[PDB]
Structures are given as C-alpha cells and as structure tokens.
Amino acid sequence: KTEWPELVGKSVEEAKKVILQDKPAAQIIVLPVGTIVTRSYRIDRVRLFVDRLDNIAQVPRVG
Amino acid sequence: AQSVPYGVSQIKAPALHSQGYTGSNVKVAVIDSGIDSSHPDLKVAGGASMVPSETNPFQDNNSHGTHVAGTVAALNNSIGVLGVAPSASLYAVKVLGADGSGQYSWIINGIEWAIANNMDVINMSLGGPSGSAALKAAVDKAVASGVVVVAAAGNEGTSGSSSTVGYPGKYPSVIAVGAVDSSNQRASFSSVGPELDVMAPGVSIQSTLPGNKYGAYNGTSMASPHVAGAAALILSKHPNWTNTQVRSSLENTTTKLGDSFYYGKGLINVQAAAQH
Ligand SMILES: [Ca+2]
Ligand code: NA
C-alpha cells in the first residue's frame, strides 16, 4: 500500500485517520497545492497537498 | 578514512580522476535547500537565497541540499566521502525552506540567478506535478544561454501507460534522471515516461549532512547530482564543448538497460562519454 486515491477531496482529519489507521508511524505533512518539493524518497513520509479549503487536492503518496 | 560511495564508481568517475580531471573551475549551481558551507568535506564558492524568510544560502535547515552537494563535489582528502567532480566550484542557490518546499517564483528566480552568474551546470533535485509558462521559459533560457540543466525525474513509480515524470524534468530542455540500485535495477519509486532521459544510482547513497555528519538517502534527488557531476567532469576535459555536446555525449554512451519508458537511454558512463 503506497498511495490513497480514495482520499479525494476528503478533509484533513479523514486523510489523517485513514492513513494512520493504515500506516501507524506516518510522518504527515500538510503543504499548499502548487509548491515545489525535494525529490528524496522517505518511506515514513506522506505529504498532503491541500486547497485553501483544507481538502486534499492530489493523490497522497508514501515518500 | 575516506570512503568512495558505490554510485561514484558505478558511473566510472574514478577513471577520470586518474587523468587529472576532477571538475576544476566548472561552476555548478545546486538549486535546493541550501548547503552547509562549514562542512569539513565541502568547499562552497558563492551563492544567494531566494527564500524570503531564510536569507542565508549557507545554512541548510533541511539537510537535503548539503547531501546533494556532496554527491556532486565532496572533497578528495582523508575524511568522509568523495564527489563525482571533487574540484568543482559549488554554488548554493537556496530556493527551498526548512520544510523542503518553495514557491514557483523562488525556483524561477534561482534559475535566473544561475544564468546571470554564468553557471556551467544546474542541478535541480526538486519538482512538482504541474508546470507553468514562467518555469518553462526560465529553463529553456538557461539552455539557450549555454547551461547544462539536470533534474530529478520524480518518485511516483508507475501508473500504467501514463507518464509520472514531474516538472521541470518533463521539459525536453531538461535531462530528467531516474534511479537505479547497485545492481542496475530500477528503484520501485522511480518515475517513468517518454520524458525520462537517463538513470543514475539513487538507492542508499552516502553523502555529507549538516553538522559534520554523513548519511545514506534514496530518491531521484540522489540520482540527479551524479549526472550534474558527470557533466562537470566532461567540461573539465573538454572546456570547449557546448551544453549540446555534453548532453549528447552522455546520452550516446550509456550502458543500455530495459525499456526506455522505464530506463530512458540507460545508466550513464562518464568515462565513455568523455572519450567521444
Ligand atoms: Ca572527502
Ligand atoms: Na526531459
């Protein structure tokens, strides 16, 4: 399990619950949509890209 | 003692060091989170920060930039690691904050600074899922001006027949670099698609880390500086070659691996590229 298509325009908390209630040690980070990020791949990390409505805009993904 | 990380030998950089070619006087901008200039195994020649609240490019609050810079150019001495191009002049062009993110206009401003200061090679270990007219313009102008431009392909794996290469790697003007392991096998995370150009080591790569540390990282971020460093080696042996020639010498001398959709032209070989 490496990506959560199923997390759509779900809220912050629904994404945090599903992901933790699936990957306990997740280091979760919320960042704006439309930013550039490093391309390191870290198995612990799930970056969450939100709109100005605090909803998930893009498929969340391990790394 | 000094260790040679396996990726530096896999690309054959030591054969060039053995003829006296190590990057001397070639200017490499690492456009990233900054570089820890007080690292004992690094020499930073200059820099500028585009990040409005972190104005020191010589302080790396993330760790990413410093690790990328050690792959390019960790010094040849009796400590730590050894870079692909260990006499290169490293420039820290900080465009990312402590959390490893930046705005598109900060990235663009970084590329513009690199052109204005006559950089020979740009490395971009960074990306996003969408492009923009201003970003496309800025990398195409760096290339027009003579700069070799290299970037991470992305860490999104496969999604059927769809391409997963992010920007700016997706631009034809940019060498987009994917990741292999010490067995020349593609790493599971490595992005794929027609825009993928070459492969380089991306799995468990040891490099420099802020505060006199060393550490292994994975990602197409770690594969890209192998190729930026390779470019600097080729220019130190052939200072008369253009960006066109450097790029084509790398693309034409790779060790061929799988399907181009998954492996681009294959793994770079700088010893062969430099004999062209
Ligand atoms: Ca060293
Ligand atoms: Na490309």
Domain limits of chain B?
1-276
How far, in Å, from the CA of B192 to the mean position of ligand 2? Answer: 11
Q: Which residues contact B276 (CB under 8 A, 6 or more apart)?
A: B249, B252, B253
Chain B residues touching residue A63 (CB < 8 angstroms): 155, 189, 219
Give Cα separations from B106 to A35, B44, B77, B244 (angstroms): 10, 21, 35, 27
Residue from B35, B125, B156 to probe the interface with A (highest A Cβ count within 10 Å): B156
Task: Check the annotation: does B212 bind a ligand.
Answer: no
- Active site residue: B33, B190, B221, B236, which one? B221
Residue B251 Cα to chain centre, angstroms: 15
Contact B104 A36 (CB under 8 A): yes
Total CB pairs under 8 A between chain A and B: 74
Please indicate if the annotation marks B169 as binding a ligand: yes
* CATH assignment at residue A6: 3.30.10.10
User: CB within 8 A of A53, min separation 6: which ones?
Assistant: none
Residue type, B237: K
**Chain-chain contact of B128 with A41 (C-beta, under 8 angstroms):** no
Which residues does B42 contact at the CB level (< 8 Å), separation at least 6? B35, B36, B66, B69, B70, B73, B74, B75, B90, B208
Six-digit token string for B205:
């790569």
Cβ distance of A37 and B64 shorter than 8 Å: no
Work out the number of other CB atoms within 10 angstroms of the CB of residue A59: 15
Number of domains into which chain A is organized = 1
Q: Which residues pair with B167 in a beta bridge?
A: B128
* Reduced 3-state DSSP string for B22-68: CCCCCEEEEEECCCCCCCCCCCEEEEEECCCCCCCCCCCCCCHHHHH
3-state secondary structure at position A11? strand
**The two structure tokens encoding residue B34:** 């900054």
Interface residues of chain A, partner chain B, Cβ below 8 Å? 2, 29, 31, 34-42, 58, 61, 63
Q: How far is the CA of B110 from the centre of ligand 2 (A)?
A: 19
Q: Is B221 a catalytic residue?
A: yes
Cα B266 to ligand 1 centre (Å):
28
Chain breaks in chain A (C to N over 2.5 A) after: none
**Rounded to whole angstroms, how far apart are CA atoms A17 and A2?**
16
Does residue B168 have a cis peptide bond before it, meaning omega lies within 30 degrees of 0? yes
Collapsed DSSP state (helix, strand, coil) of residue A27 = strand
Q: Give the helix, strand, coil percentages of chain A, each rounded to 5.
A: 20, 35, 50
Q: What is the DSSP letter of A48?
A: E
Q: Annotated catalytic, B145?
A: no
For chain A, the residue count is 63
For B116, counting Cβ atoms within 10 Å of its Cβ (0-12 exposed, 13-18 middle, 19+ buried), the class is: exposed
> B93: which 2 tokens?
């062009």
Comparing alpha-carbon positions, the chain B residue that sits nearest to A38 is B126
**Residue A58 DSSP one-character state:** S
Contact between residue B29 and residue B121 where contact means Cβ atoms under 8 Å apart? yes
Smallest CA-to-CA distance from B21 within B247, B229, B234, B240 is with: B234
Residue B157 neighbours by CB under 8 Å, 6+ apart? A2, B164, B188, B189, B190, B191, B192
Residue in B111, B50, B43 with CA at minimum distance from that of residue B76: B43
Q: Between chains, do A36 and B107 touch, taking CB under 8 Å as contact?
A: yes
Q: Which CATH class is domain B1-276?
A: alpha beta
Find, among A28, A37, A31, A26, the residue nearest to A54 by Cα: A31
Check CB contact under 8 Å for B219 and A39: yes
Distance B21 CA to ligand 2 centre (A): 27
Residue range of the domain that includes A29: 1-63
- DSSP 8-state secondary structure symbol assigned to residue A9: T
